[PDB]
Hints:
5 copies of one chain form a homopentamer. Chain A is of the alpha+beta class. Chain A folds into 2 domains: 208 residues, Distorted Sandwich (Acetylcholine Binding Protein, Chain: A), CATH 2.70.170; 120 residues, Up-down Bundle (Methane Monooxygenase Hydroxylase, Chain G, domain 1), CATH 1.20.58. Helices cover 34% and strands 28% of the residues of chain A. Chain A has 6 helices and 11 strands. In chain A, helix 3 packs antiparallel against helix 4, helix 4 runs antiparallel to helix 5 and helix 5 runs antiparallel to helix 6. At the A-C interface, strand 3, strand 4, strand 6, helix 4 and helix 5 of A face helix 1, strand 1, strand 6, helix 3 and helix 4 of C. The structure holds the ligand CN1C(=O)CN=C(c2ccccc2)c2cc(Cl)ccc21 (5 copies) and 2-acetamido-2-deoxy-beta-D-glucopyranose (NAG) (5 copies). One copy of the ligand CN1C(=O)CN=C(c2ccccc2)c2cc(Cl)ccc21 sits at the interface of chains D and B. Chains A, B, C, D, E: This is Gamma-aminobutyric acid receptor subunit alpha-5.
Amino acid sequence: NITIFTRILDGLLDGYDNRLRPGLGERITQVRTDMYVNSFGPVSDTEMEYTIDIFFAQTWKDERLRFKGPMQRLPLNNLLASKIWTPDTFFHNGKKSFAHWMTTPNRMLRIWNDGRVLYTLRLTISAECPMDLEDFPMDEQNCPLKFGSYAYPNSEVVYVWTNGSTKSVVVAEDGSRLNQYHLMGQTVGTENISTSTGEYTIMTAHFHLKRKIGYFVIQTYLPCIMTVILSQVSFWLNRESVAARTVFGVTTVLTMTTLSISARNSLPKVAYATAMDWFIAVCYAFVFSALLEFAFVNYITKSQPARAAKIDKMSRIVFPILFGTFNLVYWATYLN
Amino acid sequence: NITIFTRILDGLLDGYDNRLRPGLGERITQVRTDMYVNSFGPVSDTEMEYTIDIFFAQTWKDERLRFKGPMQRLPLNNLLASKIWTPDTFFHNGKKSFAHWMTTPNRMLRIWNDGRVLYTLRLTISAECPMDLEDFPMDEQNCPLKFGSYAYPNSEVVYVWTNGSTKSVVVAEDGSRLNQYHLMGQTVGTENISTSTGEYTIMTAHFHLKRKIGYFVIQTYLPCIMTVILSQVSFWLNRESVAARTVFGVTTVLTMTTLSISARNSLPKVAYATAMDWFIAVCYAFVFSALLEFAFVNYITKSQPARAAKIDKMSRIVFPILFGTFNLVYWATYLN
Amino acid sequence: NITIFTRILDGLLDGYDNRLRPGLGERITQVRTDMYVNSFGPVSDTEMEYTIDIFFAQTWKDERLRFKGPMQRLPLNNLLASKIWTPDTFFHNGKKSFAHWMTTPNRMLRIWNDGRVLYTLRLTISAECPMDLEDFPMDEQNCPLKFGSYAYPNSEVVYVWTNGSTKSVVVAEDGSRLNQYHLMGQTVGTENISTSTGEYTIMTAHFHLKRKIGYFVIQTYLPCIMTVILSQVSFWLNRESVAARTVFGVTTVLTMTTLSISARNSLPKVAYATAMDWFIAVCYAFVFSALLEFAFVNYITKSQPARAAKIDKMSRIVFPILFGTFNLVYWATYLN
Amino acid sequence: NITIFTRILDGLLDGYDNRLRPGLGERITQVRTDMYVNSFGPVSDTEMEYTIDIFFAQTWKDERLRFKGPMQRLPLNNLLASKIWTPDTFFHNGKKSFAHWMTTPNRMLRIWNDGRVLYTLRLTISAECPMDLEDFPMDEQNCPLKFGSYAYPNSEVVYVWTNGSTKSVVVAEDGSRLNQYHLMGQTVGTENISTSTGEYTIMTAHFHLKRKIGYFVIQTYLPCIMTVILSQVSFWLNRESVAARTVFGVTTVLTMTTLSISARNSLPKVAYATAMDWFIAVCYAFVFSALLEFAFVNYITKSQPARAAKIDKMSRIVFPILFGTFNLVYWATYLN
Amino acid sequence: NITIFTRILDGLLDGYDNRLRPGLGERITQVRTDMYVNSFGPVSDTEMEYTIDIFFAQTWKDERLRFKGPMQRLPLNNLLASKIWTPDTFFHNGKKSFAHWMTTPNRMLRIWNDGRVLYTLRLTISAECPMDLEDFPMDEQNCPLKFGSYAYPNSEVVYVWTNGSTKSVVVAEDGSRLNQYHLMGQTVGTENISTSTGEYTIMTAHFHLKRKIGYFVIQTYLPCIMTVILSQVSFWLNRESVAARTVFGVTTVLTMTTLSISARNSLPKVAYATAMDWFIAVCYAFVFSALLEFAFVNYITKSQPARAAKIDKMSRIVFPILFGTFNLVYWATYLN
Lengths: 336, 336, 336, 336, 336
Ligand SMILES: CN1C(=O)CN=C(c2ccccc2)c2cc(Cl)ccc21
Ligand SMILES: CN1C(=O)CN=C(c2ccccc2)c2cc(Cl)ccc21
Ligand SMILES: CN1C(=O)CN=C(c2ccccc2)c2cc(Cl)ccc21
Ligand SMILES: CN1C(=O)CN=C(c2ccccc2)c2cc(Cl)ccc21
Ligand SMILES: CN1C(=O)CN=C(c2ccccc2)c2cc(Cl)ccc21
Ligand SMILES: *[C@@H]1O[C@H](CO)[C@@H](O)[C@H](O)[C@H]1NC(C)=O
Ligand SMILES: *[C@@H]1O[C@H](CO)[C@@H](O)[C@H](O)[C@H]1NC(C)=O
Ligand SMILES: *[C@@H]1O[C@H](CO)[C@@H](O)[C@H](O)[C@H]1NC(C)=O
Ligand SMILES: *[C@@H]1O[C@H](CO)[C@@H](O)[C@H](O)[C@H]1NC(C)=O
Ligand SMILES: *[C@@H]1O[C@H](CO)[C@@H](O)[C@H](O)[C@H]1NC(C)=O
């Protein structure tokens, strides 16, 4: 009962043209789309791109492939995929999208008596996600994913999500493979765009990203905090030890300078000030200000020692208090 | 006696459709799989991927290729591989899998009178291995390898290991080419998954990895240990040498700070504290604490020299003892 | 009413040769071109290349595809693109240009009764943009984009912009994805070139680029400015503290030296002096000159203390004034 | 006299099946192989791979292509290469081997009356060469190159070198393009391997590599030697200059620490001690030991100055002598 | 008058075999070659490769494509390129050569009544240029470019430049895109090579390269010069300031050491001494020698102060003079 299937396949192909869409000149082709994200890949800030692997599924109705037989379903493989007409779907923001070939071309194609068709297609999309690094690292990003049609305007092909929007897009629980982000949720929608040729249908999915802090705390914030504390120790050393206090001030200032260079090496070369830069700038003033206090004190330690000694003791208390007060404002404002 | 073989090949192809599986509508196709890992490639922690080269072998029974002749075996090459039906096997976790082309496409195909078939296929799979770096570097990882079918549910195609599981997967003795891991052993199993289309068969193989220590000992642990010892030398210097003791404390603190930055450059940017980070943090306190002791001593060396001198001598003994005691707890706990 | 279209397509292909241009031996083929830049990619100074993604559109008239039927337009896909003749357009400066393949080959083809044709083609061009880094970073660049024909001289194929030049090239408002440049505007034009074979038509588009400053201010300029200020603090320290003033001078000089090396690491290895190099050179003299003043003062502080003390006080005022005066000339000259 | 050749080619192809080896069921096919290495590419220690470009030549006898005519030789190109049967040769250790395509596919094929055939094939093999870095950099490596057959066991296809082994493999005098190795010589041999399918023939070629020293001398050895000499200068400074001697000891110790980190950055992350590591470890003790001597001397310079002064003078002589004595043992042992 | 051309093309292909060269068994095919270098790409010292883009043109006479008609020329495209016989030209030293595909395959093909043919082919060749870095950076290099035939010996195919050698190779004025080299000129020639198969014709073109200095002056030479000057300032400081002079000597020595490591990071790991290395070695002695002078002076400043003071003053003059004298010899010898 196998040769019976062979005759059915041969008959449908004969008299069938793959260069023409179903319902041409009679109606408008309607396509139902569903998605399942297997893994959300890493996000590269420098390249403003993210990698995503999905099992894209599409469905459309064709009246030219109707048949009757013992079975109502015809499981198949990539061999027959190119023999019939399929939509020229593309991703608008996809810089470079490539499919999978080995071990076998990941494709499927099924047909039913009523003309319903199914066409799954594994993909690996390296899309582009622009990001505004104004509140970095306390920033939230919305990386989109837009897919539609190239040569078929809305008057011919229209894409609509199957069933409700809740089940339209599915993300695996373990599919979040981000080392510096949290996948809060997803949103979907539809819209139209206008060009010279005509209107087109756009299906859009947005992923809400919440960055996870903790890597920069151990990398930039803590060294800056400890460096500031190191300089303040000089305030507890007697003035006559000019050389000893000089070493503390000079080393700390250079240490802060090199940290700023190192921090931005991996960060994108954005031409504006981020939140982290302001924190380093404030820490720079504290260490720099302490050095000035020593120089001013050392210059009047002879004529009027009383004022110099009074300032030194006062500095021990004022400086730590201001640093602690500033931190609460900085963290509370951003974490609220 | 060569043209006799030519007629046999031509006859089988005629009347044979490669788009339909054997036993369609009559039974369920059964596939027997065996593997031989030639080389386990390097594991990239940053990319969470590992490279593996295997000689994948598959076997299935087809009743449409039966023949009789002088020979019961028909050795062949890649030429006839695409002329018949082969399963659309794929790797679920394979990010990007590509076969080999030169010098000649590495493929084979053999047939027997009873319909038994053999299809070997060399492969180079760059799979993805998620890892939890909580006990790093004293961590054990289990990198999996899942392969199955794309368009053929369990009702049609089922994969089962040939013979026992012991001989199902073979790893060469010299095939372990890991510079920072040990290949302890392997495990295999089977499971099913459910999706919209239907149930599918999953064949899984797990590799147990035990990291080898010794690279980080010479890179991070030892410099931290020697840096701590350097600071303690200051306790054996007289107080009046304020400048000399200042150099020891400042240089050591900055040395520890830069080591932390350097260590995590190669390590993945995990947003949580590893075991190595805690060790560096403890070493940071020791050098930092020593600097505080000098500052406190230098501030009361005049009013009450007796207490300052007593503290200095006590510090020489307490500090080394605590560092030695802590090391035993750290190493014993992780190495046990 | 679908099979009617099938007959039309078959008839046109028969008797139609794709190896010959329309109007061969009768007239000169005329092509109308329009462009829409979806995104202007990043500019790599080291590689002197920039990436651009466009939706290139072309139009030409052919008398061999005329037909009459219910519809005056025949939307199609990549299937029929290769079946007919299309110009062998190429980019002269394109080092490596590749099209898009997945999810479907991004191409379109439409025909009309009068013979008018449309052929859109998505592209990603990695062109080369030579740049003269003489006023870097205060520099303006004009990256061109030249496209024409390879084997068809001007006597056969001529390219002309459609409608006016204003609408010939369109750039999306959000298509400017440059992190270190501003897209001021665009210009277009036409020209001819002469070679051994004959004359050819050239269509050129130029993009005016204005670099955005602010990344180098936080990276190179500010550390140099703060480093100079650090050295001048030594002028407020008494001469007897020889060791203390030595630390300031030595550390600052080495700090400037390493900044110069770090700055040019990312910058292209141009064999001539840039504007930034001169700024660093001036800052080098200030810190170096201060060290010389201390050495000269320390060498005559005994024989004639009066002159040494007078010079030290004068240095406190002259040095800051000159640095401030120089900055106004440097910034005003370049920013004007 | 050109059409005469055309008839000969057409006749041979008709009735000739490329899917069957010559002498099938009658004898065992014998293949003669010769090689000419155009250039031995660079060896990447990190990737344990080396690149080699060769002009591989193969020869086998087929009785199905016999002909008679004016010429006994038929020079041809890649066009006819795929029309006949060729062995499915492959490289066992080749991770990723690709041929050359432009300007024209580099292939050749010649036939003679007796059935002798020639098939040259340019190749670029990126093989894998495991190396044991125990005597690094005084190490000798033997990178192999194994090639055989995939689907044809020894009972069907056997590879044997043509003529003697001396002329079997040829390496160009200028083909050695190694910047850190010397190509001492080559060796060849044959062996069999056993698998599930059956026995296979293996043809192996080994290249003997002798590393050239001189890059590491200027990079690691000399800085370590000069750093040790710098510390010993402190022994010629009076004890009262506590600060001056402190700077020498601290700077040298940190300098050695950073050199160890820098040296292993390029070197593979081997989890065992190399010869170079031991040399750095010995140098670490010398500088570290000198610092301890100063601390111990400074702690008893008051109670018993005589012993402290005596030790200081003795250290000036003992330390340099031991360093010189150790170097002779280290270099002589490895260079002998 | 278009169908007339169609008949001509069809007739020529019929009865024409592309697997046989023209004049087979009657004469020797002669090929005329001309080149036009559009852009000389960057030269990578580490990889010993350079990229070049050319418009290669070839010409040969075939008597099997003669025709008569209204036009004596048949402009065409890549469609007919593969339908006829073309030489299997290849580049001997080309590691990896690839052609251009988009927007259209860059190829052309023209035919004339007498049988003359033209075949242009755009190319991007990543050739290999061995270089001897003995006088680096004052070195001159001659990167060659060899092209010939693979399967056609001299007895069948011979390559000869068209017209004179002056016009044989053309380089655009703006085609020199080298950031660290000057394109002085070009030379061409012919030669034969002998192998097992037979003699072959070689066409060679050499490009003379003169490196441009100025990048290394700002990177390595100047920091070394300024570092030496910094150390000499210590000679103008009184002996009693032991700590101050110690800082100058130690910092300068370490600064020179790190510069040597940094300089060779980008430079190829050549296992022999370059000219730049000797310059750094001389600078190393000057700073190192100054430190020794201070140590020796400080050790005898009590017993015989007169000799120590006399040496210190003499050092101020001798050391600067020797450094200036050495520079003239170094620069004059290499720049002459
Ligand atoms: C609005 N618009 C145009 O006018 C150019 N044509 C298109 C287009 C072309 C084919 C199909 C859909 C859309 C296009 C594509 C993008 Cl990704 C952004 C804007 C845009
Ligand atoms: C359970 N599931 C789905 O629902 C989506 N479809 C599939 C699938 C699709 C085709 C064959 C097998 C499985 C799939 C694939 C992975 Cl890798 C993980 C989950 C998953
Ligand atoms: C003027 N010229 C030549 O003489 C070589 N031929 C060409 C050419 C070849 C085919 C089509 C167009 C132009 C060419 C191409 C460039 Cl990109 C620059 C200069 C140049
Ligand atoms: C001994 N062996 C096997 O059992 C697996 N099959 C093979 C094989 C498969 C086809 C041809 C030759 C050999 C093989 C290949 C290597 Cl590279 C190493 C061991 C090994
Ligand atoms: C002299 N020689 C040989 O003997 C090996 N065969 C060849 C060859 C093979 C085919 C065509 C031309 C030349 C060859 C190629 C090079 Cl690139 C260098 C040396 C060499
Ligand atoms: C998009 O076009 C379709 C055409 O049927 C229309 O129904 C729909 O309302 C449009 N959507 C928007 C947002 O304009
Ligand atoms: C998987 O499906 C097969 C269907 O025959 C069944 O026999 C087997 O028990 C299932 N395995 C599991 C783990 O459910
Ligand atoms: C280019 O060639 C065309 C040929 O028709 C001519 O009309 C045009 O004036 C030429 N342009 C220039 C700038 O020479
Ligand atoms: C390999 O197999 C062949 C089979 O003919 C045999 O002659 C040869 O001795 C074998 N070599 C070894 C090393 O066993
Ligand atoms: C190369 O071979 C040709 C064969 O005709 C000969 O004429 C020519 O002189 C040879 N050139 C050299 C340099 O030997």
